[PDB]
């Protein structure tokens, strides 16, 4: 329903978020452990504070500075890629990290009762062995070819 909310409010539904939803929220990908350049005090590119992903750090200005006026609005600079808008958008835009290998969510594994164990009928000890690379697990076996 309402995205940013104008205060007419019917429900507040909660649920699990799939990878598709995570990539739908995101405005970009973070792929560099850089935060700020300490020689010009401006955020790095593709870092945790990238202006292209999260938005401009100043009202109506881009990274390359080709645009600095209010007349320019809703247009993405073709050189730096930063969208010209107000700085408050830095409080609203999210990023995402594309993991190279799958990872489990700790809330649903460590928390007692282990809700991954109940779903799969696995004791916590063996499950912890599997997900931290301390034992193998048979994910399938073919009975037709078996005998």
């Amino acid at each position: 329903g309402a995205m940013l909310d104008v205060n007419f409010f019917d429900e507040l539904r909660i649920g699990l978020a799939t990878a598709e939803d995570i990539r739908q929220w995101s405005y970009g990908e973070v792929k560099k452990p850089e935060t700020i350049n300490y020689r010009t005090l401006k955020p790095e590119k593709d870092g945790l504070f990238c202006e292209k992903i999260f938005g401009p750090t100043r009202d109506w200005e881009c990274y390359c500075g080709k645009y600095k006026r209010v007349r320019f609005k809703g247009i993405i600079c073709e050189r730096c890629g930063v969208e010209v808008t107000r700085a408050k958008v830095r409080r609203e835009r999210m990023g995402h990290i594309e993991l190279a290998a799958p990872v489990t969510h700790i809330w649903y594994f460590k928390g007692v009762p282990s809700r991954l164990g109940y779903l799969l009928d696995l004791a916590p000890k063996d499950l912890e062995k599997i997900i931290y690379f301390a034992a193998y697990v048979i994910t399938s076996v073919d009975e037709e070819m078996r005998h």
Partner: protein, 49 residues
């Protein structure tokens, strides 16, 4: 789930609500206070409001 999460055991309440896909109707005093509305008690009810 919002009132329960704000009372105690936020992690367990949140995880089981996420699994159950619970929906909150926002009818309690605490929830309306959290979301910034007029509580359904005293002067905030329809009869007087």
């Amino acid at each position: 789930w919002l009132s329960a999460a704000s009372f105690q055991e936020t992690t367990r309440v949140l995880t089981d609500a996420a699994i159950n896909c619970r929906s909150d109707k926002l009818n309690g005093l605490k929830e309306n206070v959290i979301i910034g509305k007029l509580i359904p008690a005293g002067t905030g009810i329809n009869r007087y409001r």
